[model samples]
Target: GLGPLQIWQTDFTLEPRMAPRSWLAVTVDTASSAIVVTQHGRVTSVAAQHHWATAIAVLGRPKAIKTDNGSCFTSKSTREWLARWGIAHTTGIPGNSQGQAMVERANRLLKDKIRVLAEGDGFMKRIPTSKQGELLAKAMYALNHF
Candidate 1:
């Protein structure tokens, strides 16, 4: 039966307005639809470790996790961290989003919600860098609660 932490998928994306530091990492429980979103200045193995740490705390460790072929997930440290947790790691084909479709869809939904949140706030401007992290937290809270 599908259960929390049975399987997981994660990926990274940009929040355009939050750029040079706009790297957003998203982890989703493919079984329970639980999500953990984190923001970082850049994508790196260190950031990936933080991502997993946050997700594990919030959603618990999964049996396995699938990521893309990005260097962030391919680094030795990232693999070592997963190994330490006894979590299996798998990678999708390069240039293919379908392999991690759940997180891909969540990423798109998050971008949409960011726009909606900004548009509703009367800030006719891009989401402020200072508030980007707050905005992400709000968005994920809404998503997870729904």
Candidate 2:
């Protein structure tokens, strides 16, 4: 799509140090490169929903969304949720990494900022759950505004 809010790509990245909060569901607006990142305790359809919910509340609904073939994205619950919102959900072919390039790049960008935050706060070895939330917020603030 040519405009932002047309296509959103979503995916997850894991960071064990943030256990019980190790999953990061990252969503990217393909046209604008803006992102919405949500932390989850597990990889599941609900995690994907949480990310989309936040994105919608802030940026409004996208016409469609793309994700990998992970069960979380392909599960019936996810499909029905999108259907109810009039949002089309597309899942990429398995083993095709390029399909999710947009969200993956956003993940890389935010992860790098998170790494810097951890290092600066002397939590490079491991991040506690308490601090993880704060660090994520700081990194995203930088990603979106800085």
Local distance difference test, candidate 2: 0.84
Model 2 CA lDDT for position 113:
86
Residue pairs in collision within model 1? none
Residue range 1-146, candidate 1, lDDT tens digits: 44354889999998876565688899989888888898888888999999889999998778999998889898998999999999999885666747888898999998888778877876455677777778778889888996
Stretches of model 2 off by over 4 angstroms after superposition:
1-5, 92-97
Cα RMSD to the true fold for all candidates: 2.1, 2.0
- The whole-model lDDT of each prediction reads 0.84, 0.84
**Ten-residue stretch with the least lDDT total in model 1:** 121-130
How high is the lDDT of residue 112 in model 2?
86
Estimate TM-scores for all models: 0.89, 0.90
TM-score of 1: 0.89
How would you encode candidate 2's per-residue C-alpha lDDT over 34-139 as one tens digit per residue? Answer: 7888889888888888889998997778888988888998888989998999998877565775988878888889888888889999987669867888888888
